[PDB]
Amino acid sequence: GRGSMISVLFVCLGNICRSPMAEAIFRDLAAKKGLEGKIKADSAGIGGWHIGNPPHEGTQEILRREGISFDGMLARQVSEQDLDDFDYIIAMDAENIGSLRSMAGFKNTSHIKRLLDYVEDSDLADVPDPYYTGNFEEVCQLIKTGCEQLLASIQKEKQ
Amino acid sequence: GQGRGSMISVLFVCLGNICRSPMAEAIFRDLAAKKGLEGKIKADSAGIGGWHIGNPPHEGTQEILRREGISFDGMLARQVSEQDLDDFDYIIAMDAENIGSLRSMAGFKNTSHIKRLLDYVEDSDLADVPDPYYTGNFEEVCQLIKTGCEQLLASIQKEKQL
């Protein structure tokens, strides 16, 4: 539209469960708002065990039932450069925040926030890691509402 | 129980290494001494960030420690490094952010020995020790760190069989 494309990076630990789910859901929400030419999403993980792999089967199953594509999505590890490239860096939990701030040397981190920061009220602050819980349904609900509220916040602030 | 064999080492980690981890270091050391474990367990602290390197603990923590009649002679802030991960048997973080920072630092190194202090208080929740550098509340940090160190020491005594 007017000016540069907005970019959003979702960050979790493995970049196989949470952040890919968020990337795909957010992308789908944006597409439906007709914003695909104005906002772009990616994800990445703090850790590197899963680099190059498709999302966890649990996340694939969730997305499939939502009818959301995830073709071509494959884990990658966040880098320092990502901090400069992306307008919004959206962590899943407090551990991820700690990782990102330390990577940034505790400088220029105002754009690094948790997904549930965008959900007013909200009992939870963290999206739990289902690699450990097994609870992909809970994650899906938390990520859906978080993405809806994040998109609205970006839509407001940037247009 | 146990100086019988190699010394067990515990590193307490917070953000600045001036408020929480020094308080935990001093308190935990005091608890270990009371149990007669000075010859078996050694504690240290360190911070994620580097703003306060070389400084003594925050005045609030000094005041708490004075009240508890616990010494902190020679305790001076330092920043945690990769080598600390391999050196210490236990790495005990004050909050989830601290854990995440240590994870970013670890690379391919094992991180299974990195836990939060209040993970050992089974089960309170509170899970995080609040940062009094920001909150201004040294009293609640003292209470949390006392109970956490008590449970931590008991867990180590059970695990290492003293």
Ligand SMILES: [K+]
């Ligand atoms: K990715």
Ligand SMILES: [K+]
């Ligand atoms: K220290």
Ligand code: NA
């Ligand atoms: Na940026």
Ligand code: NA
């Ligand atoms: Na070790």
